[PDB]
Amino acid sequence: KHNMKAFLDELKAENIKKFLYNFTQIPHLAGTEQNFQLAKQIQSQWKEFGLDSVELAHYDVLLSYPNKTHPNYISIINEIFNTSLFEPPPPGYENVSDIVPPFSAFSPQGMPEGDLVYVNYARTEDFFKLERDMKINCSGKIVIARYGKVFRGNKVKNAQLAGAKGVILYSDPADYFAPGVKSYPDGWNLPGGGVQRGNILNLNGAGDPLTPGYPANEYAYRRGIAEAVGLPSIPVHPIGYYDAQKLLEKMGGSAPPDSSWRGSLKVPYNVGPGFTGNFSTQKVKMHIHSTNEVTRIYNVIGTLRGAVEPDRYVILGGHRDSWVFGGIDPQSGAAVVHEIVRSFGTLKKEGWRPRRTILFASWDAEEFGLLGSTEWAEENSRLLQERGVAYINADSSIEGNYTLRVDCTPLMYSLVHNLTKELKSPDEGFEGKSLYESWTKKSPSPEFSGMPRISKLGSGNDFEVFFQRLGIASGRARYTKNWETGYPLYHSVYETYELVEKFYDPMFKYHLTVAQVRGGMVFELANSIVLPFDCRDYAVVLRKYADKIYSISMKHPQEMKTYSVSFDSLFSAVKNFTEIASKFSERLQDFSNPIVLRMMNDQLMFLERAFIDPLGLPDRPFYRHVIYAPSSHNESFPGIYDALFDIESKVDPSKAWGEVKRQIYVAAFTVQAAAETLSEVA
Amino acid sequence: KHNMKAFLDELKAENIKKFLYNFTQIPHLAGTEQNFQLAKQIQSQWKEFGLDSVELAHYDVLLSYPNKTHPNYISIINEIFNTSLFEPPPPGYENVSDIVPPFSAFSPQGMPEGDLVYVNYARTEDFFKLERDMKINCSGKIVIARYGKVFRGNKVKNAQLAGAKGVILYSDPADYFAPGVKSYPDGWNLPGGGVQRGNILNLNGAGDPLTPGYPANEYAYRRGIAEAVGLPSIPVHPIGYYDAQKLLEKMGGSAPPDSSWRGSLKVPYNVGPGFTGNFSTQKVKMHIHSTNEVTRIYNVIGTLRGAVEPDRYVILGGHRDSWVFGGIDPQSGAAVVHEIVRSFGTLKKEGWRPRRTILFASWDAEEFGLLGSTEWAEENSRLLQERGVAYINADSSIEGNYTLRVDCTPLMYSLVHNLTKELKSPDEGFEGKSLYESWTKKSPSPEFSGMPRISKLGSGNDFEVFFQRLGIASGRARYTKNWETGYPLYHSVYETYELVEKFYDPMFKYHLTVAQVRGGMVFELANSIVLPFDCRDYAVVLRKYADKIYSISMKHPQEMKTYSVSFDSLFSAVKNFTEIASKFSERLQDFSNPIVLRMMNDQLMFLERAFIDPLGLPDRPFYRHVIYAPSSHNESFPGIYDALFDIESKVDPSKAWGEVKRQIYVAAFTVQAAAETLSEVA
C-alpha cells in the first residue's frame, strides 16, 4: 500500500543524521562559491531521489560582507581596548579565514566616535521609558543594546528614530546563557567570545532592497542604493559578553529604572549617557568597513507532479544558506527536507504520485532578508496565487528538545491536531504515547483544556511572502525548549554538527519526529481528496481577535464616545463568517461530483486568499494579510492595532480616531468578504 | 433543441421596441426616486422572466445636482447677456421641471469673473501649442473649450494645470452637427439650444470619490470632501452653440494658429485673452450653485446558475441611469439586455441551464463616474477575480446605423469573428449576407485584408473596473456611424424614444443585431465546453504594441545610446509568449478528462488576469492592466508610453530615461509572467 503510513515509515533518523553531517562540514554563506556547490549537490540528489524536475532559480540581489583586509571592530579611545576580530573557532575546525567574522549584515560604513547610552533591549517600550519617564536623550549617542525580545532590525530602526549615531549589539548571559549548562564545546551554552550574527534590515516584506515587487532577474532595473528599501542609516556591530563587559563597566549617569533593565554581567547597567568620573573623558569608537554588493543567489526548486490536480501546489520550503556551519540554522531543517524528498521519491519509484503537485524548495539568502524565497515568489506570483494550496516551512528542526512548537493558519489547526494524534511521542516518559499527548501536556493551550498551544505566524522566515503578501495558507513546526527556564549559540560559529549530535539530539529522534510532522502535513495537503482545512477554526479565532482589539480601544472610552467609534460592523462580520462557515462545513460533509468537490476545494484554497487587501497596510504595500500582517509598532487586526498604538500621544485626536474607524471599516469589510467566498457560489 | 440558434431566434425586434418605449417615458437620473422605481420594475421583471435570484445591491455614493431654486448660468457683465436656464423641451414632453437642466456634474460652487481664452478642444497638445508656441498664459483666465476629441474631464484637468479659474464647455457645430441633416425634432441633429451634460471627474478608476478601494456600504468610513478622489477645483458649465456664439463673437488677442482651431460658427475663433477694443472692458461671469451629496444608488443583479460550473461567472452588464430620458444612452442598451434576459429565461423555463453561471447587471450612477459597477466590483472583488470568466458591456446599442463597432480583449477576437459570420447582416445592400461581411466591408482592418477593425478597450464605461482593475476578459459591441462624415444629441434632453424610432432604427433591426452579438457572445462564453479564447491572438498584438512603443522611443536615438535603453527584454518576452501560446493551443486541441479541461479553462480564464500588476501604474493604483490601462497623458504599454511622453522637456534626462528603463523591465516581466501561466503546470 502507498498511504501516509508508508511515507512516514520510510523516513529514517540515521539518514537525517548523515545529511546533517554532510551539510555542515564547511560554511555555506549566501552568495559564496561553497553555497552554490551545495545547491548543485542538492539539485543532483533530488533528481537521484526521483523528482520529476529539479532546477536552479537564480537572482542577483544586494548582499553584505565584511572587508577581508580591513576588519570591523569597536574601541574605547589612543585605542585602549579593542573588541575581537573573530570568535575563537571550535575544536578541530580548519578553514577559519572562510569563516565570516561576526558582523551586522547591511550596516553602512563609518567610524562614529561618541558616548554610550544603554537602551536595554531597544524595544519601542524601552525607548518610551528612556525619553518620556527618564528624560534621557539618545541624539548623537552610540547606543548599546542587548539582543533579545524583538528582531534586531527593529532595535536599529528604534535607535535611528531616537537619533543615535551607532548601535552596538551584544548577547547578555541573562538572555543567552542557561543556568547550570556548560559552554561550548562541553555543553550548549554561549561562551563569552561567541557572537550572534544577523541582518539588521527593515524591509517590511519587500525582499531584495533594490527590486521591490519584481524578481531580481537578468534584465531587472535596480534602485540606486540611496533609494533602496530598508537599509540602516547608522553603523551597527555585534559583540559577545566578554567584550560587552569591557564596554559597560565604566557606564555612568542614571541608574537602571528597575531590575528589568539589568542583565547578568558584573556591571551596574547604568543607562548613561557616558562613563563615570575618572573615565568621563574616554569615548567609544566603531570601525565598520563592510560593503553591500549585488551577488548571485540560487534556489533549488524540485517538482513532484500531481496525478489528478497537477495545477495545485503544495510547497515544502526552507533555506540552505547559513551564517557559518549552520549546524542548527538551517541544516537541521534542510536535512529533514532532504529525507522527506527521499521518502516521497521512494514511493514515486514504486509508481505512486501525490494527488496534487508538491514543490520542494531549498531557499538561498534567507539570512539576508528572506531574499531567495521572496524573489522566487515575486517571479511566480501569478502561478502561486491561483494555484498555491499551502506552504509548509522547514528551517531549523530543533532549537531545543523539550516539545513541539507549531505556528500556522487556523485553517491547519485540525490537520495538526489529527496528525500529531497518530504520531509517536519521542519524549522521555511518553513512550507509547502520541505526540499530541506529550505536546499538549508540555505546552497547554492558554484557553482550552486538553488542547496544545498553536501560535500565530508573524514574520522573520521564508513563509513570510507566501502568507503575508500572497495569502497562501502556511504553517511551520519544530522542536523547541522549555520557554520558562532563541537558543544560546544562535548564529554563532559554535552552531555545528557536534553541537546537535552531542547535546541536542544524539539519536536524531526529535529530527525524525519533526520530519514526520512536516512531511505528514505535506502528504495530507497534497493527497487528501477534500483539502484538510476547517474554516470553522478561522471563525473561532476571528471572534477572539475582535474581542481583543475592542478591549484595547476600550481603554479610551471618552474618545470612543466623542468620535462615535463603533466595533459593531466588525462583530457583525465575524458573526456572519461564523454562520456562513458553519453552513459551508455542512455542505462539505453532505456532497461522486468532482466539480462540486473542486469548487469546494477552490473555496477552501481561496479562503486564506480572501484575507489579502490588494492595497496592503498603510505605507507597507507588501504586507497585505488583514488578519495577521506584522504590526508596524511591534496583535492580529494589525491595521486597527497600529491605528490605536500610542493614540493618546497623537496631536490631532480627531484625525487619529478617524483613522481607527477607517481601519475598523476595512477589517469588517474584509471579514465579510472572506465569509462570502464560502457562500453558495450562485 | 436548446442551442445558440434557439437562443438567438427567441430575440424579437418588437420586444426591444416595447422595452425601449417603457424605459424612456420619464427621466431616470441617478439617485432619484424614478430611477429606484425603474430598478424595482427591472428586478420584478427579471424574476418573472425566470432568473434564479434577482437582488438590488445599493451603495451610498457622492452625486452632484444643480440647486433647483438657484439656477446655474453664465453672463457677460450689469449682466447684458445670460446663457439659457434649460434646453427647450422636446414636443409633447410634460414633466419639464424634473428634467435636470444642463450642468457639469461635480463642479464646485463659485462665481468667478474674468476674461475669456479659447483653448480649442483643451487637449494636452492644444495647451502645449498655447503656451510653448503662442506664448499665451491661461492663469486667472476663464477658458472656453469645445467638446470633442477627448473626455471632458481631461479638458477640466488640462485647464486646471494651466492655471485657469473656470471652464465653459460648448458643442461646436463642426463636431456635433452633421451636414445636411435637420435638427431635432425633424431630424437627428443638435439644435442651437441643445446642451451636452456630463461629469467632469478625474477618478482614474477609483469609483466613488469618498471610498476608494472599498464598497460604499452601510458602515463605510468616508474621506472628507477635501481629501476626495478626482473632484474638479474650478467651476465648469456646458452650453449650446447659440449661447457659445454670443460668448465667442467678441474674442480678441491672437488669431487661431491654424484652421484646426476654427469650428463652424460665424466668429473669428480668436484665442484671446479677452474681448476686442470696444468691449475690451466687459467680462464673463459664471454662477455655479450645484451641490455634491452622498445619495443612495441601486444596482439590479440577476443570477442564472450554471448547470456544470456554477462557480464560473459570465457577466452581461450595462447602466440604467440616464441624464434625462436616455433614449439612446443607455436605454437602447438596457432594452437589449432586458430582451436577452427574457430569451435566456425562456430556455430556462423549458429545462435548459447554461454550463456556467450568467450574471446580469443593471448598473446605477454610470453617468457620475462608473459608480455602481465600481462599488459592486469592490464589494465582490474576491469572487470576481477567482471566478470571473468574462464581462460583456451593454450601454447604448446604437450611436449610428452604419455598421458594427467592437472593442474587446484580443482573447475574444476569434469568438467575435466566428459569431458575426453566423449572423445575418441587417444592412441595406447586404441582404442574405453575414454581419461579418458587411462589417468587414464598411470597417476594414487597417492591417489585415478581409478582416474587420476591432478596437482596444480603454476607459469611460462600466467594463472599466472589470478589465482595467481586476483583469477579467472584457468586450463590447454596438452599432455606430460612418467615422468619416460621438453623435449630435449625446447627453441632451432630445435623446428620446422618438429620436430612435423615427431617425435611428425604425424597424429595430440594428437593436436586434446588437442583441444577437452581445447575447451570442454571452451564450458562447457561458456554454462552450472549452472557453472561447484564443491566446495566440494576444501574442500577435503584443508584438505589434512592442514594435510601436520601441518606435516611439527611437525618436530619441542619442538618449537611448547614452542611457543604454534596450527593448531587448520586452521583445524576448513577446517571443516567448508567442512560442508558449502556440504550444498551449496545440495541447488545447490535443486533449474525456474534465480536470485537464478545467485546468486548461482555468489557464484561459487567468490569462487576462496575468496582465494585472498588483502595484498598479505610477500614482494610479486602480489602473493595473499593464497592456491596456489608460495613459495618464492621453498607446498600449501605458507605463512605458507615459514614461516617454514629452520626455525631451524633463529637466533631469538621466532620471527620466531611468524610469523608461524601469517600465520596460516591468512590462517584459509581466509579459513573460503571463506567458508562463500557459506553460505546462508541472
Ligand SMILES: *[C@@H]1O[C@H](CO)[C@@H](O[C@@H]2O[C@H](CO)[C@@H](O[C@@H]3O[C@H](CO)[C@@H](O)[C@H](O[C@H]4O[C@H](CO)[C@@H](O)[C@H](O)[C@@H]4O)[C@@H]3O)[C@H](O)[C@H]2NC(C)=O)[C@H](O)[C@H]1NC(C)=O
Ligand atoms: C451580516 O449579514 C447580514 C445579513 O444577514 C447583513 O445584514 C444587512 O445589514 C444592512 C445594515 O448594515 C442592511 O442594510 C439595510 O438595507 C435596507 C434595504 O434592504 C435599507 O432600507 C437600510 O437603509 C435604511 O436604514 C439605515 C439604517 O438605519 C439608514 O442609514 C438608511 O438611511 C435607510 O433609511 C439598510 O441599508 C441589509 O438589509 C442587511 N441585509 C440583509 C438582512 O440581507 C450585515 O450587513 C452583515 N454584516 C456585515 C459587516 O456585512
Ligand SMILES: *[C@@H]1O[C@H](CO)[C@@H](O[C@@H]2O[C@H](CO)[C@@H](O[C@@H]3O[C@H](CO)[C@@H](O)[C@H](O[C@H]4O[C@H](CO)[C@@H](O)[C@H](O)[C@@H]4O)[C@@H]3O)[C@H](O)[C@H]2NC(C)=O)[C@H](O)[C@H]1NC(C)=O
Ligand atoms: C525567454 O525564454 C528564454 C528561455 O528559453 C529565457 O532564456 C533565459 O535567458 C537568461 C538571460 O536573460 C539566461 O540567463 C543566464 O543563465 C545562465 C545559467 O543558466 C547564467 O550563467 C547567465 O549569467 C551569466 O551571463 C550573463 C549574461 O552575459 C552575465 O550577466 C552573468 O554575470 C553571468 O556571467 C545568465 O543569467 C537563462 O539561462 C535563459 N534560460 C533558459 C535558456 O532556460 C529568456 O530569459 C526569456 N525572456 C524573458 C524576458 O524572460
Ligand SMILES: *[C@@H]1O[C@H](CO)[C@@H](O[C@@H]2O[C@H](CO)[C@@H](O)[C@H](O)[C@H]2NC(C)=O)[C@H](O)[C@H]1NC(C)=O
Ligand atoms: C556530501 O554528500 C555528497 C553526495 O554523496 C558528496 O558528493 C559526492 O562526492 C563524491 C566524491 O567526491 C563524488 O564522486 C560525487 O559526484 C559527489 N556527488 C554529488 C555532488 O552529488 C559530498 O562529497 C559530501 N560532502 C561531505 C563534506 O562529506
Ligand SMILES: *[C@@H]1O[C@H](CO)[C@@H](O[C@@H]2O[C@H](CO)[C@@H](O)[C@H](O)[C@H]2NC(C)=O)[C@H](O)[C@H]1NC(C)=O
Ligand atoms: C586596537 O587596534 C588598533 C589597530 O590595530 C591599535 O592601534 C594601532 O597600533 C599599531 C601597532 O602598534 C600602529 O601601527 C597604528 O598606528 C595604530 N592604529 C590606530 C588606528 O590606532 C591599538 O593599539 C589597539 N589597541 C589595543 C589595546 O590593542
Ligand SMILES: *[C@@H]1O[C@H](CO)[C@@H](O[C@@H]2O[C@H](CO)[C@@H](O)[C@H](O)[C@H]2NC(C)=O)[C@H](O)[C@H]1NC(C)=O
Ligand atoms: C480530524 O479528525 C476528525 C475526527 O475524525 C474529523 O472530523 C470527522 O470528519 C468526518 C468526515 O467529514 C465526519 O463524518 C465526522 O463527523 C467528523 N467528526 C467530528 C467533526 O467530530 C476531521 O474532519 C479531521 N480534520 C481534518 C481532516 O482536517
Ligand SMILES: *[C@@H]1O[C@H](CO)[C@@H](O[C@@H]2O[C@H](CO)[C@@H](O)[C@H](O)[C@H]2NC(C)=O)[C@H](O)[C@H]1NC(C)=O
Ligand atoms: C413599463 O412596464 C411595466 C411592466 O409591465 C409597467 O409596470 C406595471 O404597471 C401596471 C399598471 O400600473 C402594474 O399593475 C404592474 O404592477 C407594473 N408592473 C411592474 C412594475 O413590474 C409600467 O407601467 C410601464 N411603464 C410605462 C411608462 O409605460
Ligand SMILES: *[C@@H]1O[C@H](CO)[C@@H](O[C@@H]2O[C@H](CO)[C@@H](O)[C@H](O)[C@H]2NC(C)=O)[C@H](O)[C@H]1NC(C)=O
Ligand atoms: C441675467 O439674469 C440676472 C438675474 O436674473 C439679471 O439681473 C437681475 O435683474 C433683476 C430683475 O430685472 C433684478 O431684480 C436683480 O437685481 C438683477 N440681479 C443681478 C445679479 O444682476 C440680468 O438682468 C439678466 N440679464 C439679461 C440680459 O437678461
Ligand SMILES: *[C@@H]1O[C@H](CO)[C@@H](O[C@@H]2O[C@H](CO)[C@@H](O)[C@H](O)[C@H]2NC(C)=O)[C@H](O)[C@H]1NC(C)=O
Ligand atoms: C472559430 O472557428 C474556427 C473554424 O471552425 C475554429 O478553429 C477550428 O477549431 C477546431 C477545434 O479546435 C480545430 O479542430 C480546427 O483546426 C480549427 N480551425 C482553424 C484554426 O482554422 C476556432 O477555434 C473558432 N474560435 C473559437 C471557438 O474561439
Ligand SMILES: O=C(CC[C@H](Cc1ccc(C(=O)O)cc1)C(=O)O)NO
Ligand atoms: O534566524 C532566522 C530567524 C529565526 C526566528 C526564530 C528566532 C528568533 C530569535 C532568536 C534569538 O534571539 O536567539 C532565535 C530564533 C524564526 O522565526 O525562525 N532565520 O534563519
Ligand SMILES: O=C(CC[C@H](Cc1ccc(C(=O)O)cc1)C(=O)O)NO
Ligand atoms: O456617456 C457615456 C460614455 C460614452 C463613451 C462614448 C462617447 C464618447 C464621446 C461622445 C461625444 O463626445 O459625443 C459620445 C460617446 C463610451 O465609451 O461609451 N456613458 O454613458
Ligand SMILES: *[C@@H]1O[C@H](CO)[C@@H](O)[C@H](O)[C@H]1NC(C)=O
Ligand atoms: C577593503 O579594504 C581594503 C584595505 O584597506 C581596500 O583597499 C579596499 O578598497 C576595500 N574593499 C572593498 C570591497 O571595499
Ligand SMILES: *[C@@H]1O[C@H](CO)[C@@H](O)[C@H](O)[C@H]1NC(C)=O
Ligand atoms: C536535551 O534534553 C536533555 C534532557 O533535558 C538534556 O540533557 C539537554 O539539556 C537537552 N538539550 C538541550 C539543548 O536543551
Ligand SMILES: *[C@@H]1O[C@H](CO)[C@@H](O)[C@H](O)[C@H]1NC(C)=O
Ligand atoms: C439652494 O439655493 C437656495 C436659494 O438661494 C438656498 O436657500 C439653499 O441653501 C440651496 N440649497 C442647497 C442644497 O445648497
Ligand SMILES: *[C@@H]1O[C@H](CO)[C@@H](O)[C@H](O)[C@H]1NC(C)=O
Ligand atoms: C439611418 O440610416 C439611414 C441611411 O443612412 C438614414 O436615413 C439616417 O441618416 C440614419 N440615421 C442616423 C442617425 O445616422
Ligand SMILES: [Ca+2]
Ligand atoms: Ca525583488
Ligand SMILES: [Ca+2]
Ligand atoms: Ca468605493
